[PDB]
């Protein structure tokens, strides 16, 4: 499975690295998008934009890259993109799954969970995990608030493909 990387700042100042595993294993079509996005080697994807919507005991959501305030984003596959399957479970911290506005609506926003929340199984699909920097996803969550505002601007300054 893919290794994946993001590397996240506050204000300008670094929070650190958070490592994702892609399960390629499970949801191959989800897991290639995301990676794609980290590289950036379609021209467009995640660098340089923001964790747009925190909320606490919740998750951390990102990649609008086009409207940065959750209505945006572009997957790779030139439209929104079907619900690849829903195997994987919202079981806890640290969850990769991707955000939408109903079925079948994938685009690219995603989201790290950072507390089991199950109530979205079946309705998001889940495609990987935090393996390395669950401190800095709890460190986001720090600056995110009831209505996920969040009190610094959360940064993806860099991101791409570690294996």
């Not at 506050?10 to 490592?19: E, T």
């Not at 021209?43 to 990649?63: E, L, N, W």
């Not at 994987?88 to 926003?109: C, E, I, R």
Request: net charge positive; hydrophobic share 35%.
């Amino acid at each position: 499975n893919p290794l994946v990387y993001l590397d996240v700042d506050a204000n300008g100042k670094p929070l650190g690295r958070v490592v994702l595993e892609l399960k390629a294993d499970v949801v191959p079509k989800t897991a290639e998008n995301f990676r794609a996005l980290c590289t950036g080697e379609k021209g467009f994807g995640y660098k340089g934009s923001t964790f747009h919507r925190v909320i606490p005991s919740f998750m951390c959501q990102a990649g609008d890259f086009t409207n940065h305030n959750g209505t945006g984003g572009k997957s790779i596959y030139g439209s929104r993109f079907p619900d690849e399957n829903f195997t994987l479970k919202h079981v806890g911290p640290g969850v990769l799954s991707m955000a939408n506005a109903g079925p079948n609506t994938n685009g690219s926003q995603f989201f790290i969970c950072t507390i089991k929340t199950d109530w979205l199984d079946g309705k998001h699909v889940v495609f990987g995990h935090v393996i390395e920097g669950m401190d800095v996803v709890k460190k986001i969550e720090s600056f995110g608030s009831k209505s996920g505002r969040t009190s610094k601007k959360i940064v993806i300054t860099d991101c791409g493909q570690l294996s």
